[PDB]
Each structure stands twice: as structure tokens, then as C-alpha cells.
């Protein structure tokens, strides 16, 4: 429940927001696999309610547990898991069993129909007896009202009923048979941990046919928003699985936006109020946080602030704390707007340029050179500890991961021109933020490390990038 089940020597979970299964399987073999990524988080794979203008949040109003979405059907989803597992990329499913669709959602994405006014869902065989009595969440400080009342009209299921427990376990076991490696449980704060423990304990072992070790259990990351000093604590859930550490997203936004100083990052971890490292799923932004009014509000860094979003992603991928997750979104100017379509419904596949960058309505942050080359940085340093910390007392910091990698940041209004201790063997290194290694040359900046371990690091305060990075797996 705490082991990621990652393949050997890989790191980084990519949330391919609203991608279809066919496009995900191709991206596993063409990019994610040969670039060292560890896993992919998919949108809900079960049938959801069809709503006007096809908003993104329609996929969190389940109609049934049939694998029938705009992303594809069960046959395409199963082939996607098999093809991604063959290149070493695991699959983690966003699962929604706290509620069903609200009023106005009579049609499903796979042919099923429902009647939320009577709490009747013929696809799951669900009846009104399987739900909590109708009530609305208004207080948010009453831990009983948050877990038993209806969230924005969504029909609150009763996870204490043995029939509901059967259907959820039946659905999660079906996904395990298809080769899935873990689950992201949506709205976990609105459910009782005692009932979650029963569901989690009944799940079968992982399918060894997909290259899983015998005795492997499904990875469990729980979506809990705990900004500190709340009625519901994240410690209620850290005993049953990993949690979404949203303090990481809100703090990393404040720091790299200038609202806090970079020198304070010297004790990044539980000293900043985070959960345990082996219990923390960390990220810069998520599909909710990037739209505002999330857990971090306006302080969250998104792709729309590219220079500081890349610096924040580079710091997270270089720090040993937690399990990093990188967001891959589609461009939006309206928080309700859904993914790009070829008409008004059929999701349009992403297209790629000579950059290996995305187009056609998708941003593809995981294909940014500054992001996927830092994933290689994480894979090259392993479990090496932080050493050689330096800072100027403001917004210029640098540290090394053992003797295998070095990174430097400049968030001040003036340049960085210092001879810093790098901790690496002497030689010539390619700046992995500004380029890559090709044969015996560097695409971007070059970094020369002297016999004393010191190197000249230069990051102008007006350059497009505010971070430099080098590691031993990109020498010469
Ligand atoms: Cl999340
Ligand atoms: Sr609930
Ligand atoms: Sr200080």
C-alpha cells in the first residue's frame, strides 16, 4: 500500500490529464519509456455522465463501473496497460467511489442511463438504499457532516454497506487483473478511514504476468487536502496509504514566486509541515490546483508562469523528499473548458513537432527539456544524500546530491557569478537545463569542474531559465 511498484531505475509519475488510452500507449513507447519515467496517472476509466459543453469535471460524476469513457473502452485500456508495462511504465487509475452523478446526468459515456433524482443507477445495479440520506455539506468543520453529506449535489454513497463494499472491491480487482499498479482515490477526505481499510485490505495481489513481484500490493495514494490546523487530519489516512501533500504545492508556489526566500529551503521536508517522505505524493500543481480556488489558490505555479514553473519542478525532482508527480495538462482560458476536440466531443489526439514538443491544444509539460532532463537527474543520483549546501542569504542557492549531481538556482533580481563547490569528479559537464549531451558535445551551456570540485556557475537574473543542473550521467 506504500510501495510504488515502480520499475527498476525509474522515477516520475505523469498525470496525462484527459488523454485517451490509444495516445497514452504510444507515448509510453515513444517518449516515457526511453526517457526514464516511472508511471502514468490516467483520468477515471469508468463511465461518467455526459454534460453540456463537455466540461472536464464531468468525468468525476460516475454513471457506472463499465470501462467506457471518451478516452476509450476496456479493450483499449487493457492494451494500453500491457504496452506501457512492456517499456517499464506503470499505470495508476484515478478512482471515484465517494459519489455518483448528480441531477441532470441522465446519459452515460458508454450507453448506460441513470436517474440521480431517485438515486437509481442500473449500470452498477445501485439503488437509493446504497446511499446516505440526502443532506448538503455546509459547515466543513463537522467531520461527520463532511463524510456523510452530499458534495455539490453528488449522491453520497455509503461505503459502510456490504453491498457497496462488494461493488468497489469488484471494480478495483478488475483493474488489477488488467495489470494496474496502483490507485488514486478521489475525495478520500469525504470518506471514513475505517471503511477504506476494509476495501483496501480485500484487494488481491498484483498481476505477476505484467512483471510484478510475488506478494505485491496496490499502491494507494489518497486525495486529502490538509493545509494544517483543520478538523480532519492527514494522519487519519497515512496509516492506510500515501497522501497528497498539498502543503508542498502551496509552499513551492510561494517560494518560487518571490513571496518567500529560497534560503529557507535548507530544511525542506517535515520541517515545513509535510507528512513523512515515504507517505507523501508531491507535485507542483494538479488538475484542480492549476485552475485556481484549489488547495493553494492563486499561489500555485502553473505552465502559464513558465520560468518559475520550471525552476519549481527542477527543485522537486532534485530533492529526495517524497514521490514526485509531474502534471501534463491541456491549455485552457476557462476553468470549465474541457480537453481539445475535433468537433465538440471527440477528443483530439496531441501532435508533435520537430522539438519533440506538443501542439494541438496540449501543453505536455513532461516533454519540456527542463523537466524530462531533470527526471534523468533524479535517476542518476539515486539515494545519494544532500551535500555542499550554499546560499547567499536571499534567493541564490545551490546543493549537490552526494557526488553524483549538482544544481543551482537564481531567483534574485541580480545575476549569479560565483565559483561554487559542485561535489562531482573533475571534467566537463553539459547544462541539462539548457541542453543535452549529443556524442561528445553539449547542446546548451558547458560546465567545467576543476580538480578541487569547484566550477564557475553563471545564471543571469534575466535569462529565460533560472536553474542550472549537471550530473555524472551526462559528462563530456
Ligand atoms: Cl491529486
Ligand atoms: Sr461521503
Ligand atoms: Sr539563513
Residue numbers in the entry: 1 to 476
What does the paper say about this structure?
Drosophila melanogaster α-amylase, DMA, which belongs to the glycoside hydrolase family 13, sub family 15, has been studied from an evolutionary, biochemical, and structural point of view. Indeed, plant produced inhibitors are an important element of the plant defense response to insect predation against feeding. α-Amylases (α-1,4-glucan-4-glucanohydrolase, EC 3.2.1.1) belong to the glycoside hydrolase family 13 (GH13) as classified in the CAZy database, and catalyze the hydrolysis of starch and related α-1,4-linked glycosyl polysaccharides. As reported for other α-amylases from mammals, insect, plants, fungi, archaea and bacterial α-amylases, the enzyme consists of three distinct domains, A (residues 1 to 97 and 160 to 379), B (residues 98 to 159) and C (residues 380 to 476). In DMA, the nucleophile is Asp186, the general acid/base catalyst Glu223 and the transition state stabilizer is Asp288.
Crystals of DMA belong to the monoclinic space group P21, and two molecules of DMA are present in the asymmetric unit. Structure solution was performed by molecular replacement, using the known three-dimensional structure of TMA with which DMA presents 63% sequence identity as a search model. Domain A, which hosts the active site of the enzyme, displays a (β/α)8-barrel fold. Domain B is characterized by its high variability in α-amylases depending on the origin, and as in other reported structures it is flanked by β3 and α3, and participates in binding a conserved calcium ion (here substituted with strontium due to crystallization conditions) at the interface with domain A. This metal ion contributes to the enzyme’s structural integrity. Domain C in the C-terminal part of the protein is composed of an eight-stranded anti-parallel β-sheet. Apart from the above mentioned conserved structural calcium ion, a chloride ion is located in the vicinity of the active site and a second non-conserved and highly solvated metal ion was identified in the electron density. In DMA the conserved calcium ion is coordinated by three water molecules, and residues from domain A (Asn98 OD1, Arg147 O, Asp156 OD1 and Asp156 OD2) and from domain B His190 O. Arg147 belongs to a well conserved motif and is present in more than 300 known animal Amy sequences, but not in Caenorhabditis elegans (Lys), nor in the paralog Amyrel present in true flies (Muscomorpha), which has a glutamine instead. In the DMA three-dimensional structure a chloride anion is present and is coordinated by Arg184 and Asn286 and Arg325. The non-conserved metal ion which has been identified in the electron density is highly solvated, being ligated to six water molecules, and performs only one direct coordination bond to the enzyme Gln263 which is weakly conserved, even within Drosphila. Apart from this direct coordination, the only contact this ion has with DMA is via a water molecule to Asp391, a residue which is conserved in all Drosophila except D. pseudoobscura.
